[PDB]
Amino acid sequence: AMMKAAVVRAFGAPLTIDEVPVPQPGPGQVQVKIEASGVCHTDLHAADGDWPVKPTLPFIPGHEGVGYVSAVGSGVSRVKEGDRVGVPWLYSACGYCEHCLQGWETLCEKQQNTGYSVNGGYGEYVVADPNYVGLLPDKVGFVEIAPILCAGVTVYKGLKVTDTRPGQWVVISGIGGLGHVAVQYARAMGLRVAAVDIDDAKLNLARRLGAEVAVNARDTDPAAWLQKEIGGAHGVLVTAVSPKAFSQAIGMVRRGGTIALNGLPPGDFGTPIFDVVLKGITIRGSIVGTRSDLQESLDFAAHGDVKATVSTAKLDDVNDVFGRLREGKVEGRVVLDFSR
Amino acid sequence: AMMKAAVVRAFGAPLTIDEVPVPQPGPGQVQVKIEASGVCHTDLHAADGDWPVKPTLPFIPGHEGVGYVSAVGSGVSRVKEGDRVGVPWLYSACGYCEHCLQGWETLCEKQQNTGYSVNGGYGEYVVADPNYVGLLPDKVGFVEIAPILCAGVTVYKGLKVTDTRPGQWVVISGIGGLGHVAVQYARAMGLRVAAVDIDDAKLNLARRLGAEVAVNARDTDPAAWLQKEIGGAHGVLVTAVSPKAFSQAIGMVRRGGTIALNGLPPGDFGTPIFDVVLKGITIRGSIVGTRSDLQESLDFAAHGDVKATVSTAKLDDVNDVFGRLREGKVEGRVVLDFSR
Amino acid sequence: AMMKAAVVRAFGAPLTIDEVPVPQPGPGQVQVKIEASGVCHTDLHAADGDWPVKPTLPFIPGHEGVGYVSAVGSGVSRVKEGDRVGVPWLYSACGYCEHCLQGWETLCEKQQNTGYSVNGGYGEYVVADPNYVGLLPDKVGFVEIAPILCAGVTVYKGLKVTDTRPGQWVVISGIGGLGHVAVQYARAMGLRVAAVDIDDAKLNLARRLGAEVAVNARDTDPAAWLQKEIGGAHGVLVTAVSPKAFSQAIGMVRRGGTIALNGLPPGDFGTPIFDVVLKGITIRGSIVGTRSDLQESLDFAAHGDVKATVSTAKLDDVNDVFGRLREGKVEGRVVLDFSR
Amino acid sequence: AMMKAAVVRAFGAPLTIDEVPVPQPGPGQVQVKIEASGVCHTDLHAADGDWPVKPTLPFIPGHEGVGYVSAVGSGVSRVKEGDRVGVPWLYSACGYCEHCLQGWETLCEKQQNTGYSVNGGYGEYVVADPNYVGLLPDKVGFVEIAPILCAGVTVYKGLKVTDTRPGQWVVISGIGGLGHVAVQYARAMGLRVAAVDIDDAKLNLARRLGAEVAVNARDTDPAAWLQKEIGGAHGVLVTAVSPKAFSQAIGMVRRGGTIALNGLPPGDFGTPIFDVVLKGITIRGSIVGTRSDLQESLDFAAHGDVKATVSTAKLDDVNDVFGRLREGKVEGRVVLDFSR
Ligand SMILES: NC(=O)c1ccc[n+]([C@@H]2O[C@H](COP(=O)([O-])OP(=O)(O)OC[C@H]3O[C@@H](n4cnc5c(N)ncnc54)[C@H](O)[C@@H]3O)[C@@H](O)[C@H]2O)c1
Ligand SMILES: [Zn+2]
Ligand SMILES: [Zn+2]
Ligand SMILES: [Zn+2]
Ligand SMILES: [Zn+2]
Ligand SMILES: [Zn+2]
Ligand SMILES: [Zn+2]
Ligand SMILES: [Zn+2]
Ligand SMILES: [Zn+2]
């Protein structure tokens, strides 16, 4: 009847860990018993409120929750009890608007979002729409697979919309939680990879993870060096949370190239329109991924092409996690482990 | 042996109509006797030398010249004496670089530009590269067709890269020199047009041209209104590239839509990363087009689908033409008429 | 505490899945919570009790068990709780006999053997000597790394004692659990690899894994075929479970060549003394590997040079797994999955 | 022009002492005048033609001939007339092949064999390849040194390939023609020697030769005894290769030890897989030796460390000699004496 959960009740004060009621699945719904729950930067902004459209208090964050289906309402055919599933950012969509019909459910104006507009995976249980859960592969553990539910699918879809093809150069700007799996997806997609971050150790991660080129932003200029070495990149993926670098990205791309943006920092960034137009440059934002994007991105993990770098932590230490998460002292990703 | 031509001999200075020597075609070159020559703002930027890369002085402006091939250097096959051709902005490209080989010669870093880096059509004769001239439809007169070499191809190619298809919505932002031509291509491409401007007269023109909706930005927030009325436009063509136009385009575009920027404005514009990412928006630069683009835009002119509003003037009055343009007194396009 | 474990209570009889006491770590010992446990053919030899020296009944097999240290006995320094380790065939050795002092602990006459002389990893927990456990690489998953604890280390040491060097030919006879990773170690050690088995599917597997040439012993005489095809090999590693393959390998080497033997089917094989002497052939027994061998063989796995072909099964199905392995119906390794 | 030589004209028949031409050397050849010619069991198999590859008839046997260089052809630098040399089993190798370049000329596919494939030393003179003859020590008589060319180098190289070190144990199995010479090399090589045999005379001789231990296999299990008495031998040299000797060798050897086989018996021998694999035993064939092996073996004889038991006989009594060898009535080695 009760469960442990990290409930945000005040739009900025640390999360509390309380016994709350276990959500029961109604018709068309299922219940998921959480084994692991990934922590995303988005969770910070949910706890805080750096976003125009804000969560409703109180709520439970977590859109990288993974576990088994523990119960099922009527009318459900996609999943059964004991199925291995994840509940990602896109909690549900109407399924029949123009966006949904065209396989862009990610843009559905009637969408609900896990751990933001409805309760998420920072609890021992979570109710989900079985039509939009991620179907998880057996061969990959809960802790290792959690980050794919958001970080993975986000950078996978992001790389797809750079419109770069095998043999061409992709730049991964920022080798963090997202960035570091981005390197791995890019390689599996046959791309040549260049990495660029403020941290020279993060650049070593990229090097090990497959990148054949990396330069430090806080040293030389990324643009000038890349235009110099590789001849500019055909595509750029910006994962870097920092407002700036959404400008030096325009410079690392060669003419006719595409920059996909994963970051969600605040405020307007300076866009050199003259150069964008003359160099025929494309700038494109990419929102996580569709259900197909997600399944494809999980497949890459199953096959061993992709493997998240992950720090484990306990539900009760959630606030500790948020702390070091902000101070950029987190390597790769952090995943809450519910294992007893 | 000699000819008259408007010449820029110093930046910002009135052009002087000098007697100068007729240029002669060497091997792989042709000569063109100019019968009409389009004028546009690009010419003002050339004469003022206020773009990052200036022209070399002295020079003859004009990248919208049309006339008859009057001489043929050796090794030319594409055109012959008597052919009707235009000499567009793209004078030549290298033909072997990555861009040229992929049918993107407009991104060629070794390209020459007519009436800017090489002498243009503000004179009785001009030497051109037969491989890069525009082949003109028999049906259309020299004066009427001249602006298609610039305004025509620019907005046509711009509409193409908005990645819209028949039946979908496109917003044409700014119904002026470019815009009133864009409206017509848009219609011919099976698109539903929403016109946006602050000038009621320009808006009335859009309606006459087939615009299904016309919104005045002065009285109405077109972003709010279009989102309310049609859930946004699938494509936005910004023909008057300015901060207010850029921001509002981002507001008017439907989620997952594409914005094409048609101009070359100074400075950095503020881009709302957040909105661009959550909405999955594409921002894209487009000016003029390839030889294929041009031929396709010419064909629309030839079928009677597209007619530029045009007025004429004499070579001797080029400075006056510049004056009206600079003051913003020009309705449509001004074309220099060399006809007897 | 109790746990599930597969137990051998009578030779040739199906194993039973019993509830048994969790083994506790005494002084100098550690306890390992098993995540995955490879099924070696030695396990069948043991359960069937077809070796001259029987294992004590009853016993829990499994010497490819890997997981986390879950408890530490007093006085342990080498490893700590949470460490990822495996418990190989060589459970322990005396540490001070002639063999042990010369880094050949695999020959220690006082050695104990995991899942034979002491209980092994066909269970939820196993107690291990921390001085002899395998220290697993972070980079690799439990399921994938498990076969390296015997299959990998065995064929790696075996390849080492063939006394071949980069550029020379080695024959792998039997592409099963051991042989399929042997192909990869061989390639990683710069050898040209020839594959021999009695099943085209194993041969096809070997071809995918880097075998330059391959032959089905059932379809022609393998020794003669190899003599013509490659001029006889410089070395041969015998991982087959048929005494006949042993005799045949002796005819696969060129003069001066070395045959190394890993396979352990009961009985004798035929040594052609005359040809062995005349041709100066060396025949060599090779038994698993030392702690050094094991560390090195794990490093090849961490570097991505070697990757076991694996399929998982549940503890409950151990008998169906044994049956399939008996009838040659297994490709690569079967790894018992104890993961959540 | 003419000389006496014992000739085999029909396999298995008695030899006849015939008058045949004296072989004269051409370019790159020397002539040797025989002073003594050792006899061994290889000569019996040559005369009987009972090996897989047979001598061509007619032929003169003898691969233990020693004497003086009596003539030289052009282009000979290694020896000169008057030099004391022997013409061993390895008459010549190609010098170009893999084996020849790796110091294993004994394995040369193109080798010729003295008194087998080419005429040998059962005659007054023999033609030889100066690059392959043995260079005999000054201080040892012809009769005494003859056996070192065959028996000597065989047990010496054999001992070398047991890969034993001074201070370690070696078993000499069989103290006959070869064995009594082997005991001596072993002691000279600083090994502790254990003699094994069924004949009590041969064992008393081993003790006289420095064998620290001796066991009669008729009375006691030499394996069980040696394992208990010394912990098993580091190496075993089997000079009399019978299935029993071979089997017991596998039992007598210390784990990780090496068994070298000097004999050429027929048939396949049963080799216990379990024992060879688990005990990590090396089994190695070895007969004769390289030119280097020979020179080294001669040096030991030269230093008085090795002396073969030799009986002399005349050329005309060769058949009588063969009979003695067949009936196993020979103590030591028989050598034909051509001296005055
Ligand atoms: N002691 C050691 O040095 C070390 C460690 C213990 C295990 N052993 C032994 O290694 C052997 C193999 O182990 P495994 O797990 O890979 O068994 P496995 O069943 O997985 O593989 C056996 C392979 O041998 C092949 N086989 C049967 N007859 C063959 C033939 N005539 N020619 C070629 N291949 C033939 C099979 O086709 C099969 O592919 C076992 O006997 C095992 O006990 C090695
Ligand atoms: Zn997220
Ligand atoms: Zn929808
Ligand atoms: Zn123009
Ligand atoms: Zn080019
Ligand atoms: Zn094993
Ligand atoms: Zn020991
Ligand atoms: Zn001999
Ligand atoms: Zn040779």
PDB file of N, CA, C and O in Angstrom, chain B residues 111-150:
ATOM      1  N   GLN B 111      34.471  29.917 -55.739  1.00  0.00           N
ATOM      2  CA  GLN B 111      33.542  30.484 -56.709  1.00  0.00           C
ATOM      3  C   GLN B 111      33.847  31.955 -56.987  1.00  0.00           C
ATOM      4  O   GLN B 111      34.396  32.655 -56.135  1.00  0.00           O
ATOM      5  N   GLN B 112      33.492  32.413 -58.184  1.00  0.00           N
ATOM      6  CA  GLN B 112      33.538  33.833 -58.509  1.00  0.00           C
ATOM      7  C   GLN B 112      32.112  34.347 -58.607  1.00  0.00           C
ATOM      8  O   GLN B 112      31.216  33.626 -59.046  1.00  0.00           O
ATOM      9  N   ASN B 113      31.893  35.588 -58.191  1.00  0.00           N
ATOM     10  CA  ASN B 113      30.551  36.157 -58.212  1.00  0.00           C
ATOM     11  C   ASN B 113      30.386  37.351 -59.151  1.00  0.00           C
ATOM     12  O   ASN B 113      31.089  38.357 -59.039  1.00  0.00           O
ATOM     13  N   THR B 114      29.437  37.223 -60.072  1.00  0.00           N
ATOM     14  CA  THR B 114      29.175  38.243 -61.083  1.00  0.00           C
ATOM     15  C   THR B 114      28.791  39.585 -60.470  1.00  0.00           C
ATOM     16  O   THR B 114      27.966  39.648 -59.560  1.00  0.00           O
ATOM     17  N   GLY B 115      29.389  40.656 -60.983  1.00  0.00           N
ATOM     18  CA  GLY B 115      29.095  41.997 -60.513  1.00  0.00           C
ATOM     19  C   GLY B 115      29.591  42.221 -59.103  1.00  0.00           C
ATOM     20  O   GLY B 115      29.043  43.037 -58.355  1.00  0.00           O
ATOM     21  N   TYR B 116      30.641  41.492 -58.738  1.00  0.00           N
ATOM     22  CA  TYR B 116      31.204  41.591 -57.398  1.00  0.00           C
ATOM     23  C   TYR B 116      32.698  41.298 -57.387  1.00  0.00           C
ATOM     24  O   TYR B 116      33.500  42.170 -57.065  1.00  0.00           O
ATOM     25  N   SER B 117      33.065  40.067 -57.730  1.00  0.00           N
ATOM     26  CA  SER B 117      34.472  39.673 -57.788  1.00  0.00           C
ATOM     27  C   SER B 117      34.965  39.687 -59.232  1.00  0.00           C
ATOM     28  O   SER B 117      36.167  39.739 -59.495  1.00  0.00           O
ATOM     29  N   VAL B 118      34.017  39.621 -60.162  1.00  0.00           N
ATOM     30  CA  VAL B 118      34.297  39.798 -61.581  1.00  0.00           C
ATOM     31  C   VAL B 118      33.259  40.767 -62.134  1.00  0.00           C
ATOM     32  O   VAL B 118      32.191  40.937 -61.548  1.00  0.00           O
ATOM     33  N   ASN B 119      33.572  41.409 -63.253  1.00  0.00           N
ATOM     34  CA  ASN B 119      32.664  42.392 -63.836  1.00  0.00           C
ATOM     35  C   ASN B 119      31.309  41.811 -64.237  1.00  0.00           C
ATOM     36  O   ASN B 119      31.225  40.682 -64.728  1.00  0.00           O
ATOM     37  N   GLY B 120      30.253  42.595 -64.035  1.00  0.00           N
ATOM     38  CA  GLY B 120      28.898  42.118 -64.245  1.00  0.00           C
ATOM     39  C   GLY B 120      28.148  42.730 -65.413  1.00  0.00           C
ATOM     40  O   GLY B 120      28.746  43.184 -66.394  1.00  0.00           O
ATOM     41  N   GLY B 121      26.823  42.750 -65.296  1.00  0.00           N
ATOM     42  CA  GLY B 121      25.963  43.138 -66.398  1.00  0.00           C
ATOM     43  C   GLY B 121      25.489  44.579 -66.412  1.00  0.00           C
ATOM     44  O   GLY B 121      24.525  44.902 -67.104  1.00  0.00           O
ATOM     45  N   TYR B 122      26.155  45.446 -65.652  1.00  0.00           N
ATOM     46  CA  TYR B 122      25.874  46.878 -65.714  1.00  0.00           C
ATOM     47  C   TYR B 122      26.665  47.502 -66.858  1.00  0.00           C
ATOM     48  O   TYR B 122      27.285  48.551 -66.700  1.00  0.00           O
ATOM     49  N   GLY B 123      26.653  46.836 -68.004  1.00  0.00           N
ATOM     50  CA  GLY B 123      27.368  47.306 -69.174  1.00  0.00           C
ATOM     51  C   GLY B 123      26.804  46.627 -70.401  1.00  0.00           C
ATOM     52  O   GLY B 123      26.042  45.664 -70.285  1.00  0.00           O
ATOM     53  N   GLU B 124      27.180  47.123 -71.575  1.00  0.00           N
ATOM     54  CA  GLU B 124      26.609  46.646 -72.829  1.00  0.00           C
ATOM     55  C   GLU B 124      27.018  45.214 -73.149  1.00  0.00           C
ATOM     56  O   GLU B 124      26.251  44.464 -73.751  1.00  0.00           O
ATOM     57  N   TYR B 125      28.228  44.840 -72.747  1.00  0.00           N
ATOM     58  CA  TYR B 125      28.711  43.479 -72.939  1.00  0.00           C
ATOM     59  C   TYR B 125      29.378  42.963 -71.674  1.00  0.00           C
ATOM     60  O   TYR B 125      29.905  43.740 -70.878  1.00  0.00           O
ATOM     61  N   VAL B 126      29.359  41.649 -71.502  1.00  0.00           N
ATOM     62  CA  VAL B 126      30.023  41.016 -70.376  1.00  0.00           C
ATOM     63  C   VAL B 126      30.536  39.656 -70.822  1.00  0.00           C
ATOM     64  O   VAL B 126      29.866  38.952 -71.577  1.00  0.00           O
ATOM     65  N   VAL B 127      31.735  39.296 -70.380  1.00  0.00           N
ATOM     66  CA  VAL B 127      32.244  37.951 -70.608  1.00  0.00           C
ATOM     67  C   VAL B 127      31.716  37.029 -69.515  1.00  0.00           C
ATOM     68  O   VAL B 127      31.652  37.412 -68.347  1.00  0.00           O
ATOM     69  N   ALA B 128      31.323  35.820 -69.897  1.00  0.00           N
ATOM     70  CA  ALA B 128      30.761  34.870 -68.947  1.00  0.00           C
ATOM     71  C   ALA B 128      31.300  33.468 -69.189  1.00  0.00           C
ATOM     72  O   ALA B 128      31.895  33.192 -70.228  1.00  0.00           O
ATOM     73  N   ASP B 129      31.089  32.590 -68.214  1.00  0.00           N
ATOM     74  CA  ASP B 129      31.476  31.189 -68.327  1.00  0.00           C
ATOM     75  C   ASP B 129      30.255  30.404 -68.799  1.00  0.00           C
ATOM     76  O   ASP B 129      29.246  30.342 -68.097  1.00  0.00           O
ATOM     77  N   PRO B 130      30.338  29.805 -69.998  1.00  0.00           N
ATOM     78  CA  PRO B 130      29.184  29.149 -70.626  1.00  0.00           C
ATOM     79  C   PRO B 130      28.589  28.057 -69.745  1.00  0.00           C
ATOM     80  O   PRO B 130      27.407  27.746 -69.859  1.00  0.00           O
ATOM     81  N   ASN B 131      29.416  27.472 -68.889  1.00  0.00           N
ATOM     82  CA  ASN B 131      28.973  26.385 -68.033  1.00  0.00           C
ATOM     83  C   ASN B 131      28.060  26.854 -66.903  1.00  0.00           C
ATOM     84  O   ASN B 131      27.378  26.045 -66.276  1.00  0.00           O
ATOM     85  N   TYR B 132      28.039  28.160 -66.648  1.00  0.00           N
ATOM     86  CA  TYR B 132      27.322  28.680 -65.485  1.00  0.00           C
ATOM     87  C   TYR B 132      26.265  29.741 -65.790  1.00  0.00           C
ATOM     88  O   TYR B 132      25.608  30.243 -64.878  1.00  0.00           O
ATOM     89  N   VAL B 133      26.095  30.077 -67.066  1.00  0.00           N
ATOM     90  CA  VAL B 133      25.056  31.026 -67.460  1.00  0.00           C
ATOM     91  C   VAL B 133      23.679  30.392 -67.311  1.00  0.00           C
ATOM     92  O   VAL B 133      23.549  29.169 -67.307  1.00  0.00           O
ATOM     93  N   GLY B 134      22.654  31.229 -67.189  1.00  0.00           N
ATOM     94  CA  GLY B 134      21.286  30.752 -67.182  1.00  0.00           C
ATOM     95  C   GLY B 134      20.749  30.703 -68.599  1.00  0.00           C
ATOM     96  O   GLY B 134      20.922  31.652 -69.361  1.00  0.00           O
ATOM     97  N   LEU B 135      20.112  29.594 -68.961  1.00  0.00           N
ATOM     98  CA  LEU B 135      19.492  29.463 -70.275  1.00  0.00           C
ATOM     99  C   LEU B 135      18.050  29.939 -70.189  1.00  0.00           C
ATOM    100  O   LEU B 135      17.255  29.389 -69.428  1.00  0.00           O
ATOM    101  N   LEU B 136      17.718  30.960 -70.972  1.00  0.00           N
ATOM    102  CA  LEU B 136      16.449  31.667 -70.821  1.00  0.00           C
ATOM    103  C   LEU B 136      15.307  31.103 -71.662  1.00  0.00           C
ATOM    104  O   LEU B 136      15.493  30.762 -72.829  1.00  0.00           O
ATOM    105  N   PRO B 137      14.110  31.018 -71.065  1.00  0.00           N
ATOM    106  CA  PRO B 137      12.911  30.574 -71.782  1.00  0.00           C
ATOM    107  C   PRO B 137      12.568  31.532 -72.915  1.00  0.00           C
ATOM    108  O   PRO B 137      12.640  32.748 -72.736  1.00  0.00           O
ATOM    109  N   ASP B 138      12.198  30.983 -74.067  1.00  0.00           N
ATOM    110  CA  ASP B 138      11.847  31.794 -75.226  1.00  0.00           C
ATOM    111  C   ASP B 138      10.657  32.702 -74.938  1.00  0.00           C
ATOM    112  O   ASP B 138      10.598  33.832 -75.418  1.00  0.00           O
ATOM    113  N   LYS B 139       9.715  32.201 -74.143  1.00  0.00           N
ATOM    114  CA  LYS B 139       8.431  32.872 -73.946  1.00  0.00           C
ATOM    115  C   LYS B 139       8.510  34.228 -73.242  1.00  0.00           C
ATOM    116  O   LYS B 139       7.665  35.096 -73.468  1.00  0.00           O
ATOM    117  N   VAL B 140       9.514  34.416 -72.392  1.00  0.00           N
ATOM    118  CA  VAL B 140       9.554  35.602 -71.541  1.00  0.00           C
ATOM    119  C   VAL B 140      10.550  36.660 -72.017  1.00  0.00           C
ATOM    120  O   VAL B 140      11.674  36.342 -72.406  1.00  0.00           O
ATOM    121  N   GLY B 141      10.126  37.921 -71.978  1.00  0.00           N
ATOM    122  CA  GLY B 141      10.973  39.029 -72.390  1.00  0.00           C
ATOM    123  C   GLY B 141      12.151  39.248 -71.458  1.00  0.00           C
ATOM    124  O   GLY B 141      12.134  38.800 -70.312  1.00  0.00           O
ATOM    125  N   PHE B 142      13.171  39.945 -71.948  1.00  0.00           N
ATOM    126  CA  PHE B 142      14.396  40.161 -71.181  1.00  0.00           C
ATOM    127  C   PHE B 142      14.154  40.897 -69.860  1.00  0.00           C
ATOM    128  O   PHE B 142      14.724  40.538 -68.829  1.00  0.00           O
ATOM    129  N   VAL B 143      13.327  41.936 -69.895  1.00  0.00           N
ATOM    130  CA  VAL B 143      13.059  42.736 -68.702  1.00  0.00           C
ATOM    131  C   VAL B 143      12.327  41.912 -67.642  1.00  0.00           C
ATOM    132  O   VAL B 143      12.686  41.926 -66.463  1.00  0.00           O
ATOM    133  N   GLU B 144      11.306  41.183 -68.077  1.00  0.00           N
ATOM    134  CA  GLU B 144      10.471  40.395 -67.173  1.00  0.00           C
ATOM    135  C   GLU B 144      11.253  39.278 -66.487  1.00  0.00           C
ATOM    136  O   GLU B 144      11.023  38.980 -65.317  1.00  0.00           O
ATOM    137  N   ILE B 145      12.181  38.668 -67.217  1.00  0.00           N
ATOM    138  CA  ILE B 145      12.893  37.488 -66.726  1.00  0.00           C
ATOM    139  C   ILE B 145      14.124  37.806 -65.879  1.00  0.00           C
ATOM    140  O   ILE B 145      14.561  36.979 -65.074  1.00  0.00           O
ATOM    141  N   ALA B 146      14.685  38.997 -66.061  1.00  0.00           N
ATOM    142  CA  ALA B 146      15.935  39.351 -65.390  1.00  0.00           C
ATOM    143  C   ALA B 146      15.931  39.079 -63.878  1.00  0.00           C
ATOM    144  O   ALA B 146      16.873  38.488 -63.355  1.00  0.00           O
ATOM    145  N   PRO B 147      14.873  39.514 -63.173  1.00  0.00           N
ATOM    146  CA  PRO B 147      14.807  39.346 -61.716  1.00  0.00           C
ATOM    147  C   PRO B 147      14.704  37.888 -61.259  1.00  0.00           C
ATOM    148  O   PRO B 147      14.902  37.612 -60.078  1.00  0.00           O
ATOM    149  N   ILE B 148      14.392  36.975 -62.169  1.00  0.00           N
ATOM    150  CA  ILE B 148      14.314  35.567 -61.810  1.00  0.00           C
ATOM    151  C   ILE B 148      15.708  35.004 -61.532  1.00  0.00           C
ATOM    152  O   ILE B 148      15.861  34.016 -60.806  1.00  0.00           O
ATOM    153  N   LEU B 149      16.726  35.646 -62.100  1.00  0.00           N
ATOM    154  CA  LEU B 149      18.107  35.223 -61.886  1.00  0.00           C
ATOM    155  C   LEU B 149      18.548  35.411 -60.433  1.00  0.00           C
ATOM    156  O   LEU B 149      19.525  34.807 -59.997  1.00  0.00           O
ATOM    157  N   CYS B 150      17.833  36.253 -59.693  1.00  0.00           N
ATOM    158  CA  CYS B 150      18.203  36.569 -58.312  1.00  0.00           C
ATOM    159  C   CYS B 150      17.041  36.378 -57.335  1.00  0.00           C
ATOM    160  O   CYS B 150      17.046  35.451 -56.522  1.00  0.00           O
TER     161      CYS B 150
END
